[PDB]
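DM between two lab members

TW: hey, do you still have the Periplasmic oligopeptide-binding protein entry open?
JB: yeah, one sec
JB: this one, 517 aa:
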Amino acid sequence: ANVPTGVQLAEKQVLVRNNGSEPQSLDPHKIEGVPESNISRDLLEGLVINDPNGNIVPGAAESWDNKDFKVWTFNIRKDAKWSNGDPVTAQDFVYSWQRLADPKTVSPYASYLQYAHLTNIDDIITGKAAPDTLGVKALDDHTLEVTLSEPVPYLDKLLAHPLMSPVNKTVVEKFGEKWTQPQNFVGNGAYKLKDWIVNERIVLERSPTYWDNAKTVINQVTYLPISSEVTDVNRYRSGEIDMTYNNMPIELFQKLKKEIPDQVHVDPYLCTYYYEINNQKAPFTDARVREALKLGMDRDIIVNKVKNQGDLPAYGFTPPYTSGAELTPPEWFSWTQEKRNEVAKKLLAEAGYTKDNPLKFSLLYNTSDLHKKLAIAAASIWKKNLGVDVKLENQEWKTFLDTRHQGTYDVARAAWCADYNEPSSFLNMMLSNSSNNTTHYKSSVFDKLIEDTLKVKSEKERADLYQQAEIQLDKDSAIVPVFYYVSARLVKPYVGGYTGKDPLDNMHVKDLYIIKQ
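TW: and the structure you got?
JB:
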């Protein structure tokens, strides 16, 4: 942390942060959500990390270089250590990435290595080749060489993702599934696992072995699993919580802005809220049905009138303010909602749907005040505009995600957040074989366009290919874009270090600090 000279630090450096929900796990290769990533970042550190403003800086690796962006060499920090005193080595990373890729691990982020384009990853994921054939090796215990199948200029940004953090082989093989337990957990981040009570809390304490410990200020941080943004806020206002999760309840937003203006932070956030259509489940396999729901949704109402928290109506998947994105909204985005509703009903009609036989389906969302109110608004808008009937259904975060991967849903509320500030971080999730693809959209046409992005010889050609990719997504109406996020959260006045300038909002508790009174 960087305490600005002048400000006095409180005697008790303790922090309580809400984290949306009970995490899926603390193992980096078993996670996929923001709640997960939040805790993962304090406990484990990858080759490189994001600073308070989103810039990529040295993590486990002190320096690195690349040859043609195809071969990357990282010089592992000589003082990087695990919480148990063992050295963090190049082999640790070789072991970790091989585990991530291994189908036996069933990681929701196995494809991340495909996004990175490590050599032989495709055969490993399918099970045709052994994980040890992965293009990553330790030249020596402190030199890691990464070989890609093609040049990837943004590899450095990509590597900051939790999922690319190392795990301790000894510990993992020793306790297996029980390695993330408080008594067994070993990490290399700024904090270590003190305690974990399912549905109640997770406590992290300062890790003395962390190579940058001298700058760490907060000695203990507690992550709560409160999914009710209302309870969360009211459990910020009563003083029990220092930083709310970045999901504000519609019931209390305006009141909060009026009562505690300077504590309400709303900043650009690279994430997109959309309704995910199961592309392989019947009636939604029909592009006309999908397109109708896409056109029938009224973004102006749900975004600027129901939520009204600063978000931007979305016309595609990739946020246009993503670095390197050069997008423009599709034709239909320009029409009037009346016009769009006209087209949508025509499509539903020629698709065999009528007043006598309307489209009826379920809308699934993860338990939450916010998503519930948005889902009710969405069900309402589609009914009035398309005459379809939507039955709402909610599930807890962990089950919600599982359900989506299993494809046991019709329509689900969803949100994808960038892992790195580049368009492919979004578009790659739509690739037909991506372990992250919960929409089940499979298009060889879309896959080719993204694959070509790395065969380009100019960034302009790249930006152009991403646009074509977005066009292809829209053409097939794979999803129903709703809005590009703003990160809205409450931060106590005495909590310093939060800048709100990191587009990815990849905060590290090691950069925070408690101001005196």
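TW: got it. The two ends are 19 Å apart (CA to CA). The chain is about 30% helix and 20% strand.
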